[PDB]
Amino acid sequence: LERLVGPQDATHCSPGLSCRLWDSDILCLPGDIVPAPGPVLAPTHLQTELVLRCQKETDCDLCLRVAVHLAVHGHWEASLQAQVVLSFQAYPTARCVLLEVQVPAALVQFGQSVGSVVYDCFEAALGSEVRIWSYTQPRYEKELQHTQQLPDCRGLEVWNSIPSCWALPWLQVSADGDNVHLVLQVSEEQHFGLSLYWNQVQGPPKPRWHKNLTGPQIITLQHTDLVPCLCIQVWPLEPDSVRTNICPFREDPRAHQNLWQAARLRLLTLQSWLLDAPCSLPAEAALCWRAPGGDPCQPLVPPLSWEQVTVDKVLEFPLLKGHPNLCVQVQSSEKLQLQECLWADSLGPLKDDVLLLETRGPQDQRSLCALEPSGCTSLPSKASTRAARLGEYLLQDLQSGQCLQLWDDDLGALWACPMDKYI
Amino acid sequence: LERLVGPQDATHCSPGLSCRLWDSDILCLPGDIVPAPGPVLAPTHLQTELVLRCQKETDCDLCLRVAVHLAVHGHWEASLQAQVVLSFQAYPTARCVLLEVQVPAALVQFGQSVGSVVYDCFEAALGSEVRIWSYTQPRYEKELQHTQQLPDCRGLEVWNSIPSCWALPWLQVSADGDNVHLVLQVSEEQHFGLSLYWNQVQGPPKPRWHKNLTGPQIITLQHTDLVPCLCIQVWPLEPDSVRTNICPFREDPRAHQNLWQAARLRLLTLQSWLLDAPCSLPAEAALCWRAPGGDPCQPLVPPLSWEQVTVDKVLEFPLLKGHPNLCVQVQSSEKLQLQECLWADSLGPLKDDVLLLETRGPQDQRSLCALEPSGCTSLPSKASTRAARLGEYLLQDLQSGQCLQLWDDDLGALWACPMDKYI
Amino acid sequence: SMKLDIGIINENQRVSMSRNIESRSTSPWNYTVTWDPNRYPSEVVQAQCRNLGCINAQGKEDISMNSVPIQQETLVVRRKHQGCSVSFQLEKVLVTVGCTCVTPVIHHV
Amino acid sequence: SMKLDIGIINENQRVSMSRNIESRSTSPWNYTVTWDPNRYPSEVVQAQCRNLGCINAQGKEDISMNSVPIQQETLVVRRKHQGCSVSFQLEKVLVTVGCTCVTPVIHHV
């Protein structure tokens, strides 16, 4: 049965069979196969049942009940006897058991099964592979080998009937005090180690906090840590303890809030930039044209496109030169998150320059348009906007080479022309 | 003596003492101390001598000769006898030896030394620590323990009397064929692994070549590898083989030649640059002013200084803005090695701009000088040089703000003014 | 010769706790089961390092480190037969129990 | 009981080659010599991992990896006394031989 009383080894067996235990962890040797001088007892096959051995209600081992069927083999010619060894190897340990069995002369039928004998039991750790051998002494036939596998702590039998499966550093979260709290309902005497890391995708290592502790404990989170990939790792301070990994911020709102709050754009070369962020979220990027008025930065799509940018990886510009009025806009989930103008300290601040977009029509003509806040206006135009009133002077500026080229194509080009001469 | 014949164990002893060997790697147990029923033989102290055991002239083990002095202790009351065990522990192995000793009744003097017995020998590996115990059976006094240490393969005794110390992958160098050759005079059947690395100082890892081989072999070197810190590492393909490290290019001339040939300057930010080199040699750096004429780049010391630059580490400029005529000169051992103008593709090529150096005299005056190839010339000057003829126009250009400031100080400043208006 | 009792004193300790050490190790090893019916234990497990180097975070071999066996001397019992006078004799067997990752010896000139 | 011969068969092999494994290992260990005069071997060396984590290239502890002991069951001989009828009995001792560096188990939800 599943639970057995105190660790007294036990052997029972079939009706009418005599069975005595000799187990002193005995020395077991199968030796060579000798011929049978008449009828011998011989084991037919092996079988195993999983049991539990509790010495106190607290300490319970996984115990393996072994059984062996017996038949009468050998030569044919008043009751029979034998002694059978059950060897139990389960790296690193091993234990052997010797059983004495008598079978009466009335159950002696040459060529049938005469009964079976059952031993409880072999203790073994969780999830350990167990070789079990069985043989008569002396050995008249081949040995009996069985290779089994015990269940993990996961598995209804184990974790329900075993109390030893519950040393979990139980974790709870409490974001109610305007901050976030981590509660560790463990035992008072629990020594354990705790790690807070930023779970990057490719190249995961990003440690953030490490501590040896003796809980239970409640840890408070800083506003700089709440990012999506912020994950927790816990384990008791024991040799080869098992570590628990959880990411409860995978979809916290303030997590993404602080994540994009902490993201930064930083220039490398004139034609290479970099994005810094605690976590790695999907995002697209594109260059933007910012007027000196302030925020109304019109993205340059077309002739550009939103290219994917990955955190901690370089994206390269397609520009010929940089300009103080060239920002970079970074969106994620099709929502503008970051807007940083990377040339504002190297070449800035924003100059009073108008952006022009020329399109090479058929026959390699050239038609020009000026990107104003109210969309683009073709030149020359009859409007009262600042660009249309002075469009002729702007064309004179371009065809004299006074404008700065920023992008060249086969059927398109971009320019910027200063306006300080008219103001 | 140093070399002994075939591995027959041997025991000899003092004049008049009978000594028989029983060593079958016997089971040795000191057990408890029993009282002495009259006089007993008792070991006084232990001593060791280092020997060599050769079974064939090829295979020789380090062997340790053990000896023990005997006295007569116990109670005082026809010849005496005893059996003494020498235990030899040397992790991981251990071996025990039993000796039978008779001493005649005429040498029996209570309170003196009665002789000594010598056993050859205990084989042990090189440089292995050896515990040696000795005790009588039965044991009447405390045990005898000695802790010794055997010599390394280095050590005249070992490497001279042992042939097993010579598996060296012998290395030779041959730079005669206009290239460099590495010859590995080993045995034909020698399996070994070979590594060529660039021996950096801080953060050493810089692998360059890895190969499993079965030598002997001759390896040819490419012109891109001959650098000072190029080092070789060799070891036979055996468990825990010993690896040899050698750096024969520490002072090869063509090594440094190719090293500075491969060094590169590369811009990060406008005010940060980087030096790439296979090895890490000491070097100083300073900004330089290059005329459009070509090579005659005059270093800007003063007002600058040669700052140390380390390979694979950033150095930061002290400039306000970059200029196409600003190169960086890098010297080592006070000899100009590299000269690279880092703004020649971002803002270049060289502009027709004259460099000016103003010095704020007392009362915050301003006196100006122009850096020409023939040193500096104060302005205004009466010479026929291009700067002195047009010095008045240059002062007019500066005081109108048309010149570009590059460095500001409390008592100094640097400027660059374009010259296209006069040519 | 002396009397050797058939029962084996058992320590009773069950300190055994790790699992799949041989695969989780940075110096992984494989096992070889040697079998002898006239030897106790009949099954003797011999380990063997899988590689010369050690396994890095990416699962690739690192030849800058060496996998080395840990060997220990142990005792087994040999069954001997000389007709009716069955006797037993102790025998020393060297068992490789597992491997560890060590730094190679760097001799230099 | 049966006859146990006093001589111990020796393998004669001298495979023993590494040196200072315990210190060169990435999972270094310390040794504890246990002594018993009525036990063979009288000296039983027990290893103990020095740290929980493993030692990195800089010589600092790395808690992302675990040092774990390798334990093996071995046999020793116990000397027993019952006056003149000296007898011997086998005894199983669990010996920690060294340590290895393993990756910790990462259970997750």
Coordinates of C-alpha atoms in Angstrom, one line a residue, chain A residues 24-32 61 89 91-96 123 125-128 131 133 135 139 143 151-153 238-242, chain C residues 4-10 13-14 16-19 21 24 31 33 35-43 45 77-79 81 88 96-98:
Chain A
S24 CA 21.8 -7.0 6.6
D25 CA 22.6 -5.0 3.4
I26 CA 24.1 -8.3 2.5
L27 CA 27.1 -9.1 0.2
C28 CA 25.5 -10.3 -3.1
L29 CA 27.5 -12.2 -5.7
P30 CA 25.8 -13.8 -8.7
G31 CA 28.9 -15.7 -9.8
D32 CA 29.1 -18.2 -12.6
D61 CA 11.3 8.5 1.4
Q89 CA 21.6 -0.1 -7.7
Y91 CA 23.7 5.8 -8.4
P92 CA 25.4 6.6 -6.2
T93 CA 24.0 4.1 -3.7
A94 CA 23.3 0.4 -3.7
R95 CA 21.7 -2.2 -1.4
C96 CA 21.2 -5.9 -1.5
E123 CA 14.3 3.7 -0.6
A125 CA 15.6 9.8 -4.0
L126 CA 13.2 11.6 -6.4
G127 CA 13.5 11.1 -10.1
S128 CA 16.4 8.7 -9.8
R131 CA 18.6 -0.7 -11.9
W133 CA 18.8 -7.2 -10.4
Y135 CA 19.1 -14.0 -9.1
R139 CA 22.8 -19.0 -10.1
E143 CA 20.3 -12.8 -14.3
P151 CA 8.8 10.4 -10.8
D152 CA 9.9 14.0 -10.2
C153 CA 8.5 16.0 -7.4
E238 CA 21.8 24.7 -0.3
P239 CA 24.1 22.7 -2.5
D240 CA 22.5 22.5 -6.0
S241 CA 19.2 24.1 -4.9
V242 CA 16.5 24.6 -7.6
Chain C
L4 CA 34.5 -11.6 7.4
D5 CA 30.8 -11.3 8.3
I6 CA 28.3 -11.4 5.5
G7 CA 26.3 -8.4 6.6
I8 CA 27.4 -4.9 5.5
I9 CA 27.1 -2.1 8.0
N10 CA 25.0 0.6 6.3
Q13 CA 22.5 8.5 5.4
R14 CA 20.7 9.6 2.3
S16 CA 22.3 12.0 -2.1
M17 CA 20.7 15.1 -3.5
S18 CA 21.8 16.4 -7.0
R19 CA 20.4 15.1 -10.2
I21 CA 25.3 16.1 -12.5
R24 CA 24.7 19.7 -16.1
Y31 CA 29.3 6.4 -17.9
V33 CA 29.1 0.0 -16.7
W35 CA 30.2 -6.0 -15.0
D36 CA 31.9 -8.9 -13.0
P37 CA 29.8 -11.7 -11.3
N38 CA 32.6 -12.7 -9.1
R39 CA 33.1 -9.1 -7.9
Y40 CA 31.3 -7.1 -5.2
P41 CA 30.0 -4.7 -6.4
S42 CA 29.2 -6.7 -9.6
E43 CA 28.4 -3.4 -11.4
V45 CA 30.6 2.4 -13.0
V77 CA 35.7 -8.2 -3.0
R78 CA 37.0 -10.9 -5.3
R79 CA 35.4 -14.3 -5.0
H81 CA 37.3 -20.8 -5.9
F88 CA 37.7 -14.0 -0.7
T96 CA 36.9 7.6 -12.4
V97 CA 33.9 9.1 -10.6
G98 CA 33.4 12.3 -12.7

